[PDB]
Specification:
The structure is cut from a larger assembly and holds two copies of chain A and three copies of chain C.
Chain A lengths: L4 E7 L4 H7 L9 E8 L5 E8 L5 H5 L9 E6 L2 E6 L6 E3 L2 E2 L15 E7 L2 E6 L5 E3 L4 E2 L1
Antiparallel strand pairs in A: 1-3, 1-4, 2-3, 4-5, 6-8, 7-11, 8-9, 9-10
Chain C lengths: L16 H16 L10 E6 L5 H12 L3 E5 L6 H4 L4 H8 L5 E6 L4 H6 L7 E6 L5 H15 L6 E5 L6 H10 L6 E5 L8 H9 L3 E4 L4 H4 L4 E4 L34 E3 L20 H20 L6
Parallel strand pairs in C: 1-2, 1-3, 3-4, 5-6, 5-8, 6-7, 8-9
Helix pairs in contact in C: 1-6, 1-10, 2-10, 6-7, 6-10
The structure holds uridine 5'-triphosphate (UTP) (2 copies), N-(phosphonacetyl)-L-aspartic acid (3 copies) and zinc ion (2 copies).
Amino acid sequence: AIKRGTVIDHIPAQIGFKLLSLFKLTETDQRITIGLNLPSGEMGRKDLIKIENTFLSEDQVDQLALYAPQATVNRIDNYEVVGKSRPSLPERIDNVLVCPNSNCISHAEPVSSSFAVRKRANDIALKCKYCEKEFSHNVVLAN
Amino acid sequence: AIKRGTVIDHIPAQIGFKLLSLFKLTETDQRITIGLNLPSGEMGRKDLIKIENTFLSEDQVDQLALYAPQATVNRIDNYEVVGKSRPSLPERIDNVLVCPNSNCISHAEPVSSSFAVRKRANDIALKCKYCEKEFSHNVVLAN
Amino acid sequence: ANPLYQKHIISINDLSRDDLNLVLATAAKLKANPQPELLKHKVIASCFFEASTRTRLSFETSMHRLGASVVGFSDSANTSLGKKGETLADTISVISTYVDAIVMRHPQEGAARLATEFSGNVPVLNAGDGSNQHPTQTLLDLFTIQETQGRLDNLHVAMVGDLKYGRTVHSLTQALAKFDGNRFYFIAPDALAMPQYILDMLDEKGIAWSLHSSIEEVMAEVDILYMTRVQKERLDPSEYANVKAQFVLRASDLHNAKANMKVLHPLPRVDEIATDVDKTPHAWYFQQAGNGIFARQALLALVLNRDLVL
Amino acid sequence: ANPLYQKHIISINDLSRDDLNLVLATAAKLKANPQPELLKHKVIASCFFEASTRTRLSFETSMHRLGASVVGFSDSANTSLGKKGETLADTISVISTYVDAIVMRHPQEGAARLATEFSGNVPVLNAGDGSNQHPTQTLLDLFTIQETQGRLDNLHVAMVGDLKYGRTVHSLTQALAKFDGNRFYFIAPDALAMPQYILDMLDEKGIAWSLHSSIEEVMAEVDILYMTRVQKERLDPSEYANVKAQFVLRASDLHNAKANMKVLHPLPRVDEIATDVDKTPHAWYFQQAGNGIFARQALLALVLNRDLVL
Amino acid sequence: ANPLYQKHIISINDLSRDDLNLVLATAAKLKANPQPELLKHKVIASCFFEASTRTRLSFETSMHRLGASVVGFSDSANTSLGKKGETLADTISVISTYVDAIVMRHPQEGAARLATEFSGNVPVLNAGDGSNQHPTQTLLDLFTIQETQGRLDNLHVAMVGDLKYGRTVHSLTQALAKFDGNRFYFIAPDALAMPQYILDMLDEKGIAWSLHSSIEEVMAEVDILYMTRVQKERLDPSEYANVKAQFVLRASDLHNAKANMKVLHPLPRVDEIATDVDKTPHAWYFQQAGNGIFARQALLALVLNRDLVL
Ligand SMILES: O=c1ccn([C@@H]2O[C@H](COP(=O)(O)OP(=O)(O)OP(=O)(O)O)[C@@H](O)[C@H]2O)c(=O)[nH]1
Ligand SMILES: O=c1ccn([C@@H]2O[C@H](COP(=O)(O)OP(=O)(O)OP(=O)(O)O)[C@@H](O)[C@H]2O)c(=O)[nH]1
Ligand SMILES: O=C(O)C[C@H](NC(=O)CP(=O)(O)O)C(=O)O
Ligand SMILES: O=C(O)C[C@H](NC(=O)CP(=O)(O)O)C(=O)O
Ligand SMILES: O=C(O)C[C@H](NC(=O)CP(=O)(O)O)C(=O)O
Ligand SMILES: [Zn+2]
Ligand SMILES: [Zn+2]
C-alpha cells in the first residue's frame, strides 16, 4: 500500500506486463510495485501496478481501455483513495502503435502515429490518421 | 514473503524490467511480485523480483552475471532462505547474444551464438566462437 | 468567407454533401462566366512526386485561366528531397513560405495529410496520395455524372477493375454515399476488392451494394459504368496475377445499355476499354477529363477567394 | 595416428608449435621425395566463395600431385546457394556426404568454423574466412621463413600495410608467437592497425613489438619484411582514405638491408611493392608462393593419412 | 550387354521397372564393394546450364570414384554458346566428338532429348531439363525408399509443395507407378498442382491418389513424406502469390507419424522444412543426398560398361 500516487487495480492476467512495456511505466525513478497472477474475487486472477507520486489524466486512463476495459484506477493521497475511475474507450490512440500499411507516410517521416478508435462487431477497428486504411487492433503493432 | 521459489535481490536500477523481458519471467501463471526503485542500504536504489514455486535455469543465472554482477539470488522453501548465491560468471554464454561484427557468419546462418567470456582490465571481453573477434560486453550490451 | 475558404482538401471523408454541391455550383458559374483574373497575384505550387498527365496539366491550366502563377516540379528527382535526403516535412515547411496554396501528388498514402501539419496557413490540395484519396478526381467525376444524368441521387453506379488500389473509387464511393438512394455494383477480382472501410461506411448508411462477376449482369441497370485501370505500380508481387485487365469493355457489350448510360474512366486506360467504345454515344471519359478544368477552377476559387463567385 | 589426422584446420590459435613443426618437416620431405599416390582414391572438395588465384590453384595442384581427385567451384553463383537460396549449412551438410575433405574460402568470418558443425567426420580446411584466419598461408609462410633464415626463433619481423583486415598476418603473428624470442615491427596506417586481440596475445607472452611509421626505421634490423595488400573489398566506406598503399617498397629502399633479409608478400600486390624489387636478391614472394605446393601437400597428407613414413 | 549399355537416360517414361531395379541392385553392390577403376580411361562431360550443388558434385564425385576423368562447365556464360551465339545443337555436336558420355542440366524442357539427336553414339544423361524430368534424382530417391522401407510396392507416399514445376516428382511419380499397389497423396497449392498428364497416367494404371490441403490429414498414414521447394525460377509472374512455401513441416507435426516414416526432399529447402526437423529420426534428406553417389555411380557403370560382375 502506497502513500501517494496511482494504483491500477483489476488488470486482467498477462496484461500487466504488456502495459508496463507499452506505456513505458518503468522509465522513472519512482517506486513501482507490481503484482502479477494475484488472486481476486470478482475476476479470480488479476494483475496490479502501483506507481508512487505519479498520476494519470483521464485520457491516460482511457488509453488502458484497449487492454484492460474492466480495470480500476485509484488515485491516492495521504494513504487515502481520493478518486476512482474506469477506462472508457478513447477516441484516439497516439504514438505507441505502428501503422501496418507499409506504404503509409508515417513510417518515413518525423510524425507521431495516430489512429481513430471505433467499436466494430465485438472488435476494435483502428483508422490511421494519415493513410486512412483501417485495421483490427489485433494486427496494429506497438513501438 | 513467499513460501517456495526464487528471490532476485540487489538488481541495479533500470535492470529489473529488462530481466523480466529476456527471461520471459511473466509468461507463467505463478504469482510474481516486483519492486522497482526500492530503497537499498547497500545500493541506494535497487530492483527486486519474487517468483513463487519457480527456480531459474542455470543459463539464466549464467546470463544474470553480466546484467547484474552484484545481484543476489535466494532460493526459498518453507518460507526459508535454503539457498543464497551470487551469480558466477561463466566462461561461455550461448544463444542470447549477438556478435557486433556485421560480417560474422553467425548472422546469416542457423546457428546459436556463442561467446567466450573473461574479465579484462576494467570491463568484460566477449569472444565470438565464429569470427574469433573479441569485444567489450558493453558493445554486446545493445545486442 | 465561403465554407471552403483557406480549407485543406485532403479526403472526401472530411467533406460534407454541402461542400461538394458548392464546388459544383461554382464550376457551373465559371464555365458560363470565366473570371480570368480571379486569382491574379496568387502563386501556387504544383508538386507532383509521382506521374501525372491529366491531374497536373488540368490543375495548372486552371490556375492560369484564373490568372494565377505556377511554380513546382513534375518529378521529385531534382528537388533537394530527391538528391540531398530532405524529408517531405522540411520540403513543405519551406515551400509553404513561398506560395498561396500547395497542390501535391505523392506515392505514399497520407502525404497530403502530413503536409498540412507543416504548411501553416497555406492550404494543401490532395492531387492523389498513394492508393488512398483523389478528391479532385471525385469532384470532376461528380460534375460529369451531374451533367449527363441530371442528378447525383438515386443512381445505379457500377465500378469496375482495381477497387482496392483505386484512390479514385475510394473518394467517389464516399462522395456518392453522401447522396440519397444510390446503388452500387462492384465488379473486381477478389484480390483487388473494394476495402472493408468503404463497405462498412455503406452498410452504416443503409446503402445497397452488391458484388458481381460480369459487366453484362448489370449493363441493363446502370446509369454510370465507372471503369478503372489496374494500379500495377501499387501491387504487391503477390498480386501480379491481376496486372492484366480482367474486364474488357467493347462496343458490342453496350447493346442493352440504357440511352442515358455513360461510360466513365478517370484514365489512363490500358485495355479495359477497347478503342471501339470511343465512337459510341456512351463514351464520356474524354468529356470527363475536360470537366477537370471546371472542377479544379472552382476548387481553387473557393479555397483562395473568400467571396462566393457569381 | 599423427596429431593432425582427421583434424579441422580452422585457426592458428588451435594449433601448437609441435603441429606447425610437423607440417614443416613433412613439407620438407615431400619437396625432396614426392609421393604421387599418397592420396589415391581420395576426392576433395575445393569450395571457393570468394576470389583466389594462389590458394585455390596451389591447393588443387597439391591434391593432384598426391593422386587425389578434385570437385568444387570457384564461384558460388551457380551453386544452389547462389540461385535457390540454400544456406551454407545445408551446402556443407550435403557436400560432406560426397568427399573426404573440404577446402573452403569464404567472405564471412567464421564460415569455416561453422562448416565443421555440419561436416560430421569430414575435415574442413580453412582457405580464408573473411578478415579472420588464413592458416595455410601461415604454413607456407613459416616454411619459407624456415628455409631462408634457418630458424623460426629470435627473428626480427616487420609486417607492413593493412594489418587490420589482413587474415594473413593475424595467423602469421599468432604462429610466430608460439616460437621464442621473435620481435615484431608493425608498420600500418592507424585506421588499419594490427587488432588489439593480437597485441594482447603478444603482451601476455612477453613478446616485444613496436609500431613504426616507416620501413626505413627498421630496414637495417629485419630478417623478414612481410608486405601486405590493402584489403579494399573489406574496407568500410569510412576507411576509403586508406585504399591506396601507404608504404611503397622499391629497390632503392633496400640499400641498408641485412644480406639475408627476404621480402615476403602473400600476394597479390597492387602498388606496395614496385616491380624493380623483383630482380633484387631480397625479393622472395614468388618463391614463397611456390612453397604453397609443399605446405598444402604436407597438410593434406597429414589430415588424410594416419601415418607417413618418409 | 546389360539393358542400359550405351543408352540415353532422358525420361523415366522410357525406363521399365526392370531397368530401375537394375540400377538399384547395381547401386547396392557398389555401396558395399567399390570399383575404383571401373571407368578408367573414360572422359565424361559435365555440362550444367543452370545452377546445381548436389546433382553436379555427386555426379562428378561418382565419375572420380569410378576412375573416370571429367570435363565441362557449371555456367554457360563462358562457353561459345554464351558469348559467340552458338546453338545447343552445335555445342553437343562438337562435345560429342571428345567424350564418352554427356551429363547435362538445362533450363529448357527438352534440351536433353534434343542433345541425343546431335550426340551420335555418345550417351546423354539428363541431370534436369527445365520443369520436365529429373531421372537421376528418381534413381537415388527410389534407392533411398528401398533402403528405408524394404520395398517399392504398397507404399503410402505423400508429395508436398510445388508439384507443377517439380521435375523431381514428375519423374518419381512415374517410377513408383511402375510398381504395384502404391498410393499417392498430393498436397499442393491449386496453382502449383500435379500436372494432369501425371494423373491420367495414374488413372489408366488404376493407381489410387488423392488431393489434400494439409500434411496433418495424412501424417499417420504415410511411409514417405516427400517435401519440395517452390521452383521460383520457373514461376510465371502471375504465380508470384505462391513464391512462399504453403506447407511448413516442423518437428511437432511428426507426433502421429509412423515410426518407419522418412522425410525426403531432393533439396535445396528454403522454409518448407524447419531446421528442428533435422534432429528427428524421420529426417532423411541428407542421407538421401548421400545416396546420389551410389545411384549415379551405378548408372554410369551400366551405361559405359557392357557387363558388370559384382
Ligand atoms: O501491495 C500489495 C500486495 C498485494 N496485494 C494483493 O492484492 C490482492 C487483492 O485483495 P483485495 O482485498 O485488495 O481485494 P479483493 O481481492 O478482496 O477483491 P477484488 O480486488 O477482486 O475486487 C490480494 O491478494 C492482496 O494480497 C495488494 O493489494 N497490495
Ligand atoms: O522482500 C522484500 C525485501 C525488501 N523490500 C524493500 O526493500 C527495501 C530495503 O530493505 P531491505 O532490508 O530488504 O534491504 P536493505 O535496506 O538492508 O538494503 P540492502 O543492503 O539489502 O540492499 C525496503 O524498504 C523494502 O521496501 C520489499 O519490499 N520486499
Ligand atoms: O492512375 C489511375 O488509373 C487513376 C487516376 N488517374 C489520374 O488522376 C489521371 P493522371 O494520372 O494522368 O493525372 C489516379 O489515381 O492517378
Ligand atoms: O588477398 C590478400 O591480399 C592476401 C591473401 N592472398 C591469397 O590468399 C592469395 P589468393 O587470393 O590468390 O589465393 C588472402 O587473404 O586472400
Ligand atoms: O531444385 C529443386 O528444388 C529440386 C531439384 N534439386 C536438385 O537437383 C539438387 P541441386 O540443384 O543442388 O543439384 C532440381 O530439380 O534441381
Ligand atoms: Zn497509415
Ligand atoms: Zn562473430
